[PDB]
């Protein structure tokens, strides 16, 4: 009943197995002779065991700047920071003499250290295709008062599949079991591909390209503060032998996005691929099928509404003393029924029936005389 | 006396032509004229007309959305009329399960407040508006003047490619005429001085204007109505379920990379100033004073500069001052004089290669110091 209202909807009918294609933002309605009508939707795609390959720094900050110099011929200066792996250091030469605190005139050694702190990062993950979990929701056409257009899941059986565990049998309370035999059909091969995750954005990129990025990194093993290649975001400037300066190279966030234009983007995990499934319905049964026909009169709870695919939805309530009973329905015969074998459970609870009316003027007849409803449609 | 200690130092001996640049000092000498030290202390672009200001890092705040049921028209927010907001109209799937009596494509509208976090401004600078600051320090052998980088001993002078020629007066030495010619690296015409925080570059005008970033015109400085906000903002609605507004991330480092093949600026500029110096109005201070009679003392051990020259600081004891210091080994601090017995004197001289004898004063109490170059 979930598909009712979804624009990207398919009506798959089985001859007298049934093959369906599920993907994100797409719903599927399945029908078969003397079998219940079912609604399928791919609710979530997830990469589960991800091995971090490398983590890169895209925005950094330099703090705790410290400098030490020596007078000419007094040797090389040193800071403890040169042994701290979170610090970036550089040795240079400055002009020393009487006017800047030295007895001799010459090139005095200098050393500048600063604390490299990462503000933003992006991690590249290796994902095994077989570790890609899919979440499918199966909702039967139960004509329930609340089931129409419901996106919660309080009416649908959730089921999980993986390219390995491709086939699953799923039980539906009152309809029996349904066998699901799903085949994986992703867009890009995860082998030699890296799932590059940047905050809320994500992409699938070539391994060599990823490793060849000129940015400070931490290995997959060290998930640490000892960023390798700090030099790629840090610059030391001493052009006139007067002073050494340490400068951060600025955020590579937008730079990365631009570099990632000709790459497979991922929405956020909403993946490009589709799941080609096969459906066995031999273990499925129409709920009721043994119930007798309704004798009483019906009331129109909600004005007949048309879906984006030309089909119509009728909300009706029972009044007679027959329930649980089969609702008599006809579109004179011209149009077909989507909510096959419509049944009443309680007089109080209304029923939603979806049917395909014929092109032009039609007559929707619900119930048996006396008190027969003869509604009019125009498709 | 400023040049003593500076590695990038030139000894120009004579009009006299000199070349001043940043981190470079120049020592000038002429027959019966005082020895002078020149340094280019500051280069400044003075009347800069902001051409355009670009946003390199932005933030989206105050996100608001309004939708309509199918056939109920187009939604609207007041924000669509606020110029600090970026908005977009789209279509979503509407129906019974999401609050509509009808099933169809209901119109949606998403607005968010575009706030700039970081910018870079491009400035048009007139070549003639480029002010230079030169410091002239005479070789006065003063106790504090040696290696001093303050300016409490040097006459500051300002020049511009227009006002290229200036006469500068030195208290006790007369006046010095300097006729400077501009020699910058890149022509400021069709060039834009792109300033990003503490970094700066000189770039092509067309390239600058053709940058795909949000911008405020030179006229609107301090405005909030950023043009082209779209360049840093993205609206995502792939499944007709929801519209999302996303910031495109800092272009700071991106810009630095794009600016590799550009003339970088540290305002410390690339160019040099080729000057001409007229010293006819300059005079040696003393020149009329008599020779010192007394004995001299060695205040500080003789030190060698990076250019082989030596510096001697000495104090007077006799009752002759103000008087000319007798000196013999060429001399850099020409006509060394005593002003007060209390105040020592710094004399810079070029010793010969190998063993030499630095003789300061007249007998009795003559100093006969030894050098090895």
């Amino acid at each position, epitope marked *: 009943m979930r598909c009712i209202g979804i624009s990207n909807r398919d009506f798959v009918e089985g001859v007298s197995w049934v093959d369906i294609v599920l993907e994100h933002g797409s719903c599927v309605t399945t029908m078969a002779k003397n079998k219940p009508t079912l609604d399928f939707e791919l609710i979530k795609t997830e990469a589960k065991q991800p091995a971090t390959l490398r983590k890169y720094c895209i925005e950094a900050k330099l703090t705790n*700047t*410290t*400098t*030490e*110099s020596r*007078c000419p011929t007094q040797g090389e200066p040193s800071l403890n920071e040169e042994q701290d792996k979170r610090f970036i250091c550089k040795h240079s030469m400055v002009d020393r003499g009487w*006017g*800047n*605190g030295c007895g001799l005139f010459g090139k005095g050694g200098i050393v500048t250290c600063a604390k490299f702190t990462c503000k933003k990062n992006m991690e590249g993950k290796i994902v095994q295709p077989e570790n890609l979990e899919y979440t499918i929701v199966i909702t039967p056409h139960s004509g329930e008062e609340h089931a129409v257009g419901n996106d919660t899941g309080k009416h649908g059986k959730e089921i999980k599949i993986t390219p390995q565990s491709s086939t699953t049998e799923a039980e539906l309370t009152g309809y029996g079991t349904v066998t699901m035999e799903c085949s994986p059909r992703t867009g890009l091969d995860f082998n030699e591909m890296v799932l590059l995750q940047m905050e809320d954005k994500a992409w699938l990129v070539h391994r060599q390209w990823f490793l060849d990025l000129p940015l400070p990194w931490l290995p997959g093993a060290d998930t640490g503060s000892n960023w390798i290649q700090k030099e790629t975001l840090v610059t030391f400037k001493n052009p006139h032998a*007067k*002073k050494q*300066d340490v400068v951060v190279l600025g955020s590579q966030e937008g730079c990365m996005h631009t570099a990632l234009t000709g790459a497979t983007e991922i929405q956020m995990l909403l993946f490009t691929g589709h799941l080609k499934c096969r459906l066995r319905m031999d273990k499925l049964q129409l709920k009721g099928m043994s119930y007798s026909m309704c004798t009483g009169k019906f009331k129109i709870v909600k004005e007949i509404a048309e879906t984006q695919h030309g089909t119509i939805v009728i909300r009706v309530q029972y009044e007679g003393d027959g329930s649980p009973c089969k609702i008599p329905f006809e579109i004179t015969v011209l149009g077909r029924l989507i909510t096959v074998n419509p049944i009443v459970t309680e007089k109080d609870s209304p029923v939603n029936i979806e049917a395909e009316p014929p092109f032009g003027d039609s007559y929707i007849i619900v119930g048996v005389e006396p008190g027969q409803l003869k509604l009019n449609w125009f498709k | 006396m400023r040049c003593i200690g500076i590695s990038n130092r030139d000894f120009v001996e004579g009009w006299v032509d000199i070349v001043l640049e940043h981190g470079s000092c120049v020592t000038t000498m002429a027959k019966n004229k005082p020895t002078l030290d020149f340094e280019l202390i500051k280069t400044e672009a003075k009347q800069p007309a902001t051409l355009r200001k670009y946003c390199i890092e932005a933030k989206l705040t105050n996100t608001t959305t309004e939708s309509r049921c199918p056939t109920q028209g187009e939604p609207s927010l007041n924000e669509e009329q606020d110029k600090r907001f970026i908005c977009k109209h789209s279509m979503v799937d509407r129906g019974w399960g999401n609050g509509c009596g009808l099933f169809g494509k209901g119109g949606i509208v998403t607005c968010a407040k575009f706030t700039c976090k970081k910018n870079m401004e491009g400035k048009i600078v007139q070549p003639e508006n480029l002010e230079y600051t030169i410091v002239i320090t005479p070789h006065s052998g003063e106790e*504090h003047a040696v*290696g*001093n*980088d*303050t300016g*409490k001993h040097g006459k500051e002078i300002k020049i511009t490619p227009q006002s290229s020629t200036t006469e500068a007066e030195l208290t006790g030495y007369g006046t010095v005429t300097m006729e400077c010619s501009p020699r910058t690296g890149l022509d400021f015409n069709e060039m834009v001085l792109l300033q990003m925080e503490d970094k700066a570059w000189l770039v092509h005008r067309q390239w600058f204007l053709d940058l795909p970033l949000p911008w405020l015109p030179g006229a609107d400085t301090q405005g909030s109505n950023w043009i082209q906000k779209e360049t840093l903002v993205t609206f995502k609605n792939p499944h007709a379920k929801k519209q999302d507004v996303v910031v495109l991330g800092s272009q700071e480092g991106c810009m630095h990379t794009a600016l590799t093949g550009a003339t970088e600026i540290q305002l410390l500029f690339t160019g040099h100033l080729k000057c001409r110096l007229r010293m006819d109005k300059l005079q040696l201070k003393g020149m009329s004073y008599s020779m010192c009679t007394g004995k001299f003392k060695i205040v500080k051990e003789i030190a060698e500069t990076q250019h082989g020259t030596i510096v001697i600081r000495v104090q007077y004891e006799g009752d002759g001052s103000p008087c000319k210091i007798p000196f013999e080994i060429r001399l850099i601090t020409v006509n060394p004089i005593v002003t007060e017995k209390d105040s020592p004197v710094n004399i810079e001289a070029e010793p010969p290669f190998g063993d030499s004898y630095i003789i300061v004063g007249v007998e009795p109490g003559q100093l006969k110091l030894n050098w090895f170059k």
Partner: antibody
Amino acid sequence: VQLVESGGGLVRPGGSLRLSCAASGFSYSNHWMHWVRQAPGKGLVWVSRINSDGSTRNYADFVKGRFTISRDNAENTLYLEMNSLTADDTAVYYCVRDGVRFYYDSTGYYPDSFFKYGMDVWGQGTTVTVS
Amino acid sequence: QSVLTQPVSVSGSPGQSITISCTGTSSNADTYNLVSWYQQRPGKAPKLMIYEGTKRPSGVSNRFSASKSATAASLTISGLQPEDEADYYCCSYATSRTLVFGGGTKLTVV
């Protein structure tokens, strides 16, 4: 030659304050500047120092990273930005010049180890009460 | 680390001579070579009396002198006057880049 401090007053525990100091009568840009404090009825306690360039900023051990020293050379101003203040920080804060370093390094840049120094010019001090 | 210790108090009579010591723990010869002394009169700002262990700035009375060794630094006040009643502080480097004051000595002129 004078140093005049400003920005002192009553602050709540955990609060922030920015002290300022106006310098006059000397070549400010070429001198190291220090902050010294004195709790009521207690001794002088060294807080921080800054070189000409601001490239060297040193702090006493009790300033874990709560205080930031800064300067504006053209404005002849010294600052002390203070956050997460406690009763331990209640004191008179003095703005101080290192006049003797100027006679050895007239640039005021070089952060040589154990440099000859002398705190020769002091302001009257500004009172900070964390209460 | 370097920690500077001074006597808490010293009493003297007018015309007499008094010596205030400044002794360090994790200190060395350079600690004392760099000692500076400050006089703080009641209700007044501190005043530099000595720098570089033994140097007296111009304007400071010749009654103030100082001495240094490899183990201590001392300030001597000759011909004690009532105006000498003050707190005296020694100062030196705690580390290569930080300074520290001694606890101070309260001098009472009886």
